[PDB]
C-alpha cells in the first residue's frame with residue numbers, strides 16, 4: 600500500500616537514529632559513528648520504511664560467516680534488530696522489511712535467515728513467529744576478562 | 747596431564763571425543779575438522795591421560811558480534827568435552843588456562859562463551875572456570891531458501 604522501503608543513507612541518518620535509539624539506547628555520537636561504519640560495510644543491511652514522509656520502521660541485518668547457534672549452514676543472513684513504531688504495528692511493515700532482507704541475503708547465496716531475541720522479550724518471540732521464524736535454541740552467554 | 751593441539755595425526759582422537767559432544771555425520775565432522783586445523787583463529791586442544799585422549803576444547807577468535815561482550819574481537823569458548831571417568835579431574839580448568847594463553851597471543855582482553863539454557867551443569871562449570879553470566883537469548887531460523 601502507501602508505504603515504501605529504502606536503504607538508509609547519509610541523507611536519512613537522522614530518521615535512522617530516532618528509530619535505532621528507541622531500540623538500543625546510546626549516545627548520538629556513538630550511534631552515529633557506528634551507523635556510518637555500517638553504511639560502508641557490504642555485509643550489513645540497514646533498511647527504513649516510510650509511511651508518507653515519516654520514517655515508521657527500521658531493520659538491521661548482517662551476513663554472518665562465523666557459527667550462528669541453531670543454524671545448519673554458513674554463511675547465513677542474520678536479523679540484528681527490527682523496530683516498528685507502536686502505531687504502525689498492524690501494517691505488515693515488519694513482513695515487508697524481512698522480505699527485502701531475505702532478497703538481500705540471497706545475493707550471498709544464503710539459504711537460512713537466523714535471528715535472536717532476549718529470553719524475556721516474549722513479545723519479540725511472538726513477532727519472530729509471525730515473520731515465519733521458528734525457535735531453534737535457547738542459550739545463556741558468559742564472559743570473563745583475560746587482560 | 748599432557749595438553750597438546752590437535753593435528754592431522756591426532757584427528758581420530760579428536761573425532762571420537764568431538765562426536766560425543768556435537769551431532770554430525772563422520773564425513774561432516776572430518777571435513778570441518780580439516781579446515782579448523784588450518785585456521786589460525788581456531789583452537790583445538792586435546793588432553794591425554796597416559797596415552798588416551800580424555801578431553802578436548804575448541805575455541806576461536808570471533809570477529810563478528812557476540813552477545814554480552816563489551817569488546818570485539820573476543821576469544822570464544824566453543825565447546826569442552828571430557829570423558830565421564832575424568833570429569834572429577836580438573837582437566838577442564840587446565841584446558842581453559844591454555845586456551846586463555848592462546849587467545850592472549852592476539853591481544854584479546856575478553857573471553858566469552860555460551861551454554862544451552864537447560865544445561866545447568868555447564869552453567870556451574872562456566873562459573874567454576876571464572877566466567878560470569880551476561881545475557882540469555884533465544885535463537886530463531888527460517889529457510890529463505
Ligand SMILES: NC[C@H]1O[C@H](O[C@H]2[C@H](O)[C@@H](O[C@H]3O[C@H](CO)[C@@H](O)[C@H](N)[C@H]3O)[C@H](N)C[C@@H]2N)[C@H](N)C[C@@H]1O
Nearest residue numbers: 623624625633678679680681715716717813814883
Ligand atoms: N535484536 C535482538 C538482540 O539485541 C541485542 O543484540 C544486538 C546489539 O544490542 C546491537 O548493539 C547495538 O546496541 C547496543 C546496546 O544494547 C550498543 O551498545 C551497540 N553499540 C549497538 O550497536 C548490535 N549492533 C546487534 C545485536 N543483534 C542483544 N544483545 C541480543 C538480542 O537478541
Ligand SMILES: NC[C@H]1O[C@H](O[C@H]2[C@H](O)[C@@H](O[C@H]3O[C@H](CO)[C@@H](O)[C@H](N)[C@H]3O)[C@H](N)C[C@@H]2N)[C@H](N)C[C@@H]1O
Nearest residue numbers: 666668669671738768769770778824825860861862
Ligand atoms: N558450547 C556450548 C554450545 O554448543 C553448541 O554450539 C557449538 C556448535 O554446536 C558447534 O557446531 C558443531 O555442531 C553442529 C550441530 O550442533 C554442527 O552443525 C557443526 N557442523 C558442528 O561443528 C560449533 N562448531 C561451535 C558452537 N559453539 C550450541 N549450539 C550452543 C551451546 O552454547
Ligand SMILES: [Cl-]
Nearest residue numbers: 716717720723
Ligand atoms: Cl530482544
Ligand SMILES: [Cl-]
Nearest residue numbers: 724725726728
Ligand atoms: Cl504465540
Ligand SMILES: [Cl-]
Nearest residue numbers: 861862865868
Ligand atoms: Cl551446552
Ligand SMILES: [K+]
Nearest residue numbers: 637638640643
Ligand atoms: K551497508
Ligand SMILES: [K+]
Nearest residue numbers: 782783785788
Ligand atoms: K588451528
